[PDB]
Design a protein around this nucleic acid. Structure first.
Ligand SMILES: [Mg+2]
Ligand SMILES: [Mg+2]
Ligand SMILES: [Mg+2]
Ligand SMILES: [Mg+2]
Ligand SMILES: [Mg+2]
Ligand SMILES: [Mg+2]
Ligand SMILES: [Mg+2]
Ligand SMILES: [Mg+2]
Ligand SMILES: [Mg+2]
Ligand SMILES: [Mg+2]
Ligand SMILES: [Mg+2]
Ligand SMILES: [Mg+2]
Ligand SMILES: [Mg+2]
Ligand SMILES: [Mg+2]
Ligand SMILES: [Mg+2]
Ligand SMILES: [Mg+2]
Ligand SMILES: [Mg+2]
Ligand SMILES: [Mg+2]
Ligand SMILES: [Mg+2]
Ligand SMILES: [Mg+2]
Ligand SMILES: [Mg+2]
Ligand SMILES: [Mg+2]
Ligand SMILES: [Mg+2]
Ligand SMILES: [Mg+2]
Ligand SMILES: [Mg+2]
Ligand SMILES: [Mg+2]
Ligand SMILES: [Mg+2]
Ligand SMILES: [Mg+2]
Ligand SMILES: [Mg+2]
Ligand SMILES: [Mg+2]
Ligand SMILES: [Mg+2]
Ligand SMILES: [Mg+2]
Ligand SMILES: [Mg+2]
Ligand SMILES: [Zn+2]
Lengths: 134, 158, 50, 86, 52, 135, 122
RNA sequence: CGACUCUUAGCGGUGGAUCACUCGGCUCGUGCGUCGAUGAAGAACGCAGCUAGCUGCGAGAAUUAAUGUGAAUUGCAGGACACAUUGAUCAUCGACACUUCGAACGCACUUGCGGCCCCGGGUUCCUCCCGGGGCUACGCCUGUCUGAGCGUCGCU
RNA sequence: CGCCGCAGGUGCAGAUCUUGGUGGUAGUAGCAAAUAUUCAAACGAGAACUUUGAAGGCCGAAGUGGAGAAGGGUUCCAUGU
RNA sequence: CAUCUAAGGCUAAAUACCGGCACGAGACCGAUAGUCAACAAGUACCGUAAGGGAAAGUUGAAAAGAACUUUGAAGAGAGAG
RNA sequence: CGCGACCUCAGAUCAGACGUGGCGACCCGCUGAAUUUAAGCAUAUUAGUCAGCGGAGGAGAAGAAACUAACCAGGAUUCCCUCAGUAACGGCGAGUGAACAGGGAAGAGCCCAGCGCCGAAUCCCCGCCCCGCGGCGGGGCGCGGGACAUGUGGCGUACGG
């Protein structure tokens, strides 16, 4: 279990940190698993969600194999918005439905210098872990 | 109000005792802190004995206890003189010195200086500059023979 | 009174600006938890400290 | 008459705002605040009112300097140095 | 806080209870009565070699 | 002596506390002189004092002070102790020689009241109920 | 469009002041537009111009301060805002030189009778 | 028969108990154990595009710089931002800055009024007015300069 | 939640009990100090009370008039509800 | 006879800690309880002042927070969603 | 009858420094009740406590015997256990009440004044040069200024020197 005397298992504390987290670690909390192909190509498992990467919903009301591009990351509400995951309200307009990023899988990444560096870092660490366990 | 037989009890609780109550909830935490500082101190003085300087043989004062021998504060000046150890050098090789204890008998004096002669022979003295040994000790005699002693130095027994 | 010192006039000025209703758009903020202005003061009901 | 009628005659203020401590206890005719004792060099503070002490103690205001001090203590009160530039 | 939360038990008594608890961990009826599913166990005072 | 400062000499209480006159301050006049010199010279550290004269209504003492921030004091050891923060206003705490005498400090049977550092330290230890963990 | 402190540090104090004057006039025009109705785009530029003024001022103040530190570098007496600001208590402490110096008696004691490294056989 | 009153049940009100929940306490323990004339604690007043409070901040005012991070903030708007001729946001914070009171310090305040030394403007440098800057508290140590005394003397 | 143990801030009708809520009283007492209102019109869904006009009256210059001090602190003034 | 050497000075450790910074935990309380304060709480408000000082948690997974029609001047309704 | 030296004093917006105020849980110095108990109450108790005043630090205070003992003697201070609800105090009533020895935690010692000896060997400040900035120092130079024989520094302190 947990043997670090300086890490809390208190439910009240862990919830307080989670719901009052700053934006830069709300980014880490709002992470998403990669697809089977992406987990194959890069040796990483989960990646923090981005503004313009393509995910598909796997749980809830909007499940399916439909891939939608992310169009908003509402970190204050701990949700993301997707292209076709939307709901038509009373006055006829359309609104987006917030989806917790842990309920989607990234199928295509929005890649640049920083995302390349973070992916290389996680692959390097995981390789170190397996070669230490070998 | 007294009720039948009983003791005449006089508790001393007329004096607002609740404002000053010593709780011992930090007793286990104090033991841990003390034991950590004991381990750290033993690590700091690496080859020197953990408990500290060697203490003399001493007879307890009153008639209730004069049949018992314990470890005193430090060696007297007469003891160190006839052991031939300078008073300002004894405390540098790990010998406690108590200038204010005087010897009324030669029996306790002879016992304590035999203790100092034994200790001086048991001592291992590392040279001050490790590369240059002047009069300290043999390199074979301290290569691994010198290890940190635990417990009191030459413990006193009855 | 008409004759007032500058410190008093500066004090009443703050109390004047502070006594206004909350903005309409405040309620739309996420996790608002504010209904109206609870610190609203009326001149004829509650008198200022000074 | 001691009741309602005498309450009409009260129109002269006894206390005003104190420039230290900002409370309306600066007795005008004594020139001494009844809460902090302003003209005195020391803050008026009595142990018989723990509630009054904690209404005005350190930390009930802003601590503009102290909150910075609590931050700087963690790093040893370093000055005259900057992080490694990129 | 000075409610006397702790109790001291005699050392001889504490060793006594240890001896009894050990003695009961060797009777299959008592362990089964604790509900421990000791039915395919080959021998109730189960001992293994030191390799584990 | 120290006349009790009560209006009109009325101490409202039991007759044991009806004393107004014949009451003696717990600290010597020499301790008062050191305190008054130190409070005036709040930037200096009182070291000691001595008696230089007296008449029927006055006592005269001369008080030795040290400036803690003078370089002649700070660049000399064996007098650097006066420059440490714990050694400031010793006269207001009864740490000077004249102030210490009024505290009953000493070694021996005559001075059991301050076994522990001071009278209040000894009183505290004697009047604190050690409620252990295992009673 | 924006103003960066990184490339302001190469300028002269003359056109740094001139740049600040241009921003000050920009801000006053923006405040005029605010009370004459104005537009959303104009009102939103108020924050940007205010931040740019703070940025230009901070570069000016930093350049001036670091020149003053270089000028008084090594001089015996320095202004109070150029001295260290550790803590009032920490400033009254003895310095490192005179916390380490010892009496000639203490030096002689350590020269004659230094603490030895010893061990005791079992 | 209706009305009214009483009893019971259903439904509906009034009220907010119960239960479930908990970014709050209380208690214990651990490590540190750091304020201030280089202006503290505290107070006042201001500062957001829309902002009353709480929060944050100080005329550079819901923040500047630097560093880490690496695409948001978000109630609406608006606007950057090739994220590499450098970067939204957040975190840190060591650079800079930090209005007026306040030990509070030129004097004084339920108001206000000075003095000295420079700079700039009207003057067209001399001293009037206006603006800007720096000083102007008490106690006290070392030293300095200027001194006082029919204090003790020396020479005249 | 049951069973074997453990530990309690462990059982309410009362305390002129604490806090909160709710009744009968009860559509009840009352909305009676300083003479007094009426007609037509307008706006308006709506008029005894608003507004305008026409009357009849009151304050009666020690005023129910016109201004200030202390105190209040935006009550001042327009527009809208 | 024993014992010390006053009227000068310094000195770490073991010890204390209901305030402060940052943590960890609990056979504790669970919104009339627990801090007065789970919430814009030493706040609102009271008193000339010293000082006194509360009440106040919960839609829902997601606002999807009831478009549209209809009677009413609107509050408020009937459908619809 | 002017000019010097010293002494004792004064001024300064003089050069460089320092103190004030806050917090105050813990610590130190003072001041200090009454409710209460005594089945009344006055000594006593509450209590050297609440309230009051001053002063600190991360701890403080204490502290290296003008000690304890009476022994076959121990050996600075502080803290824990015990001595001990004891010796003792007390309208000897109610009530109050330590210490030594013993076992532990920690353990560490020293410096002046004086008596002397050493050509004041001592110290601060101001300059200038060089090596350095981190808690401002070192080295050198000054017929540079002052402190100081009304006594600075070195040896030395009861364990003797
Ligand atoms: Mg009985
Ligand atoms: Mg009124
Ligand atoms: Mg009056
Ligand atoms: Mg010497
Ligand atoms: Mg920035
Ligand atoms: Mg005036
Ligand atoms: Mg003369
Ligand atoms: Mg109960
Ligand atoms: Mg009940
Ligand atoms: Mg009931
Ligand atoms: Mg009953
Ligand atoms: Mg009626
Ligand atoms: Mg009527
Ligand atoms: Mg008339
Ligand atoms: Mg009028
Ligand atoms: Mg009007
Ligand atoms: Mg509550
Ligand atoms: Mg409830
Ligand atoms: Mg209505
Ligand atoms: Mg000066
Ligand atoms: Mg009685
Ligand atoms: Mg009675
Ligand atoms: Mg009585
Ligand atoms: Mg009495
Ligand atoms: Mg007190
Ligand atoms: Mg103070
Ligand atoms: Mg000390
Ligand atoms: Mg001491
Ligand atoms: Mg001695
Ligand atoms: Mg017994
Ligand atoms: Mg007593
Ligand atoms: Mg030991
Ligand atoms: Mg000498
Ligand atoms: Zn005040």
């Amino acid at each position: 279990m947990k043997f670090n005397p300086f890490v809390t298992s208190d439910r009240s504390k862990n919830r307080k940190r989670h719901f009052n987290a700053p934006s830069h670690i709300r980014r880490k909390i709002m992470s998403s698993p990669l697809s089977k192909e992406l987990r194959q190509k890069y040796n990483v498992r989960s990646m923090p969600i981005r503004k313009d990467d393509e995910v598909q919903v796997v749980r809830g009301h909007y499940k399916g194999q439909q891939i939608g591009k992310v169009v908003q990351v509402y970190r204050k509400k701990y949700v993301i918005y997707i292209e076709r995951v939307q709901r038509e309200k009373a006055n006829g307009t359309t609104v987006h439905v917030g989806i917790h990023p842990s309920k989607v899988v990234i199928t295509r990444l929005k890649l640049d210098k920083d995302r390349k560096k973070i992916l290389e870092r996680k692959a390097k660490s995981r390789q170190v872990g397996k070669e230490k366990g070998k | 109000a007294p009720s039948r037989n009983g003791m005449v009890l006089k508790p001393h609780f007329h004096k607002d005792w609740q404002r000053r109550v010593a709780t011992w909830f930090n007793q286990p935490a104090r033991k841990i802190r003390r034991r950590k500082a004991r381990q750290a101190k033993a690590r700091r003085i690496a080859p020197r004995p953990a408990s500290g300087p060697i203490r003399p043989i001493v007879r307890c004062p009153t008639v209730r206890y004069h049949t018992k021998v314990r470890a005193g504060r430090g060696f007297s000046l007469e003891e160190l003189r006839v052991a031939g150890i300078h008073k300002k050098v004894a405390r540098t090789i790990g010998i406690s010195v108590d200038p204010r204890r005087r010897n009324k008998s030669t029996e306790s004096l002879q016992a304590n200086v035999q203790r100092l002669k034994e200790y001086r022979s048991k001592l291992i003295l590392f040279p001050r500059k490790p590369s240059a040994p002047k009069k300290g000790d043999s390199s074979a005699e301290e290569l691994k023979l010198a290890t940190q002693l635990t417990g009191p130095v030459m413990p006193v027994r009855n | 009174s008409s004759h007032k010192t500058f410190r008093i006039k500066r004090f009443l000025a703050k109390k004047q600006k502070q006594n206004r209703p909350i903005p309409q758009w405040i309620r739309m903020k996420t996790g608002n938890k504010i209904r109206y202005n609870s610190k609203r003061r009326h001149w004829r009901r509650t008198k200022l400290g000074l | 008459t001691k009741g309602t009628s005498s309450f009409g005659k009260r129109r002269n203020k006894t206390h005003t705002l104190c420039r230290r401590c900002g409370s309306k206890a600066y007795h005008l005719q004594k020139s001494t605040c009844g809460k902090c004792g302003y003209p005195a060099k020391r803050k008026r503070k009595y142990n018989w009112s723990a509630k009054a002490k904690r209404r005005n103690t350190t930390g009930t205001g802003r601590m503009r300097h102290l909150k910075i001090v609590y931050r700087r203590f963690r790093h040893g009160f370093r000055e005259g140095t900057t992080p490694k530039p990129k | 806080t000075w409610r006397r939360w702790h109790r001291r038990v005699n050392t001889t008594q504490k060793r006594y209870a240890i001896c009894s608890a050990l003695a009961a961990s060797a009777l299959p009826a008592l362990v089964m009565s604790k509900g421990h599913r000791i039915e395919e166990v080959p021998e109730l005072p189960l001992v293994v070699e030191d390799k584990v | 002596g120290r006349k009790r400062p009560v209006p009109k000499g009325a101490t409202y209480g039991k007759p044991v506390h009806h004393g107004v006159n014949q009451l003696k301050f717990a600290r010597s006049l020499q301790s008062v002189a050191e305190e008054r010199a130190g409070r005036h010279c709040g930037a200096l550290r009182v070291l000691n004092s001595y008696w230089v004269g007296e008449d029927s209504t006055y006592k005269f003492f001369e008080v030795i002070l040290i400036d803690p921030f003078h370089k002649a004091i700070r660049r000399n050891p064996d007098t650097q102790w006066i420059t440490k923060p714990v050694h400031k206003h010793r006269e207001m705490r009864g740490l000077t020689s004249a102030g210490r005498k009024s505290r009953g400090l000493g070694k021996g049977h005559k001075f059991h009241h301050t076994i522990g550092g001071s009278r209040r330290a000894a009183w505290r230890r004697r009047n604190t109920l050690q409620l252990h963990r295992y009673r | 469009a924006k103003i960066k402190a990184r490339d302001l540090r190469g300028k002269k104090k003359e056109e740094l002041l001139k740049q600040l004057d241009d921003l000050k006039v920009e801000l006053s025009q923006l405040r005029v537009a605010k009370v004459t109705g104005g537009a959303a785009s104009k009102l939103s530029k108020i924050r940007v111009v205010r931040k740019s003024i703070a940025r230009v001022l901070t570069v000016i103040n930093q350049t001036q301060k670091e020149n003053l530190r270089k000028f008084y570098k090594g001089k015996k007496y320095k202004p109070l805002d150029l001295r260290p600001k550790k803590t009032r208590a920490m400033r009254r402490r003895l310095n490192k030189h005179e916390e380490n110096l010892k009496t000639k008696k203490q030096q002689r004691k350590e020269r004659l009778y230094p603490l030895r490294k010893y061990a005791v056989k079992a």
